[PDB]
């Protein structure tokens, strides 16, 4: 079974966020969100792969195909892998061009997930952007229009603070 995601992105100023975090937390159901610190890579043989380490969970990698409605969808197959993956993909022949760590908070929902973070460039962490980014990644096998429609309602609820659209 293979699933394709429904995600679409937007960014939020620093002063804005203080209202956004309270807005998102109350709007959706959750308890005491968690700060997620992960160190992501990108691998090219063309078959662009993303392997993420989080500061004791295992290295989770994910592939996103080419995009295929009010949503952006590309075939995705995400597979959890144990440690020592990076050297494994070196022996594969894959080459790493850049790697960036992401910092922020994520809030959940019934199916959809919201994660607010800022991209850090590595040389040694530097803020690539002054404003965070938020997406509404939804994972669902055999994607149908019904799942995407539900996101439209939720996005409209979040429209005032940040207006987000797929790109």
């Amino acid at each position: 079974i293979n699933m394709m995601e429904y995600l679409l992105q937007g960014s939020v100023l620093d002063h804005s966020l203080e209202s956004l975090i309270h807005r998102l937390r109350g709007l959706c159901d959750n308890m005491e969100p968690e700060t997620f610190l992960d160190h992501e890579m990108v691998f090219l043989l063309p078959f662009v792969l993303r392997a993420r380490r989080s500061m004791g969970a295992p290295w989770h990698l994910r592939y996103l195909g080419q995009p295929e409605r009010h949503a952006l969808v590309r075939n995705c197959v995400d597979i959890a892998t144990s440690e020592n993956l990076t050297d494994f993909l070196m022996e594969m022949g894959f080459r790493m061009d850049h790697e960036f760590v992401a910092k922020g908070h994520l809030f959940r929902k019934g199916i959809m997930k919201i994660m607010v973070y800022k991209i850090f460039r590595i040389l040694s962490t530097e803020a690539l952007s002054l404003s965070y980014l938020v997406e509404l990644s939804v994972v669902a096998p055999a994607g149908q229009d019904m799942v995407s429609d539900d996101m439209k309602n939720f996005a409209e609820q979040l429209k005032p603070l940040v207006h987000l659209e797929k790109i």
């Binding site: 109350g26 709007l27 959706c28 609820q157 005032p160 603070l161």
Partner: protein, 109 residues
């Protein structure tokens, strides 16, 4: 708390507005006495009514962008239920410690 007291003051201002409006009409039924009062009262009316109207208009502008979430899911329940529940556990200790004390109060005789 913050900005609730302000709106409370504004709720008092409208009462002053109606009283001020009444004085304008009331002492317009005056005789020669108190001449040119309407000039002062009229100033206290237009400025005050515009003052109170602006304050409420500010709130709507305040509300529009920072608020108006449709539902809320704070759900402060997993702590409330288990707190009284913990007290019930503590209460279960109350009675049974006392029952022990009564039981070993019989030891003394």
């Amino acid at each position: 708390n913050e900005r609730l007291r302000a709106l409370e003051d504004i709720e008092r201002e409208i009462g002053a507005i109606l009283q001020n409006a009444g004085t304008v009409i009331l002492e317009l039924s005056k005789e020669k006495t108190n001449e040119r009062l309407l000039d002062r009262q009229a100033a206290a009316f237009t400025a005050s009514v515009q003052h109170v109207e602006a304050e409420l208009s500010a709130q709507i502008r305040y509300l529009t962008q920072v608020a108006t979430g449709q539902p809320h899911e704070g759900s402060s329940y997993s702590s409330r239920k288990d707190c009284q529940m913990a007290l019930k556990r503590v209460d279960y200790a109350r009675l049974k410690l006392s029952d022990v004390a009564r039981t070993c109060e019989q030891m003394l005789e």
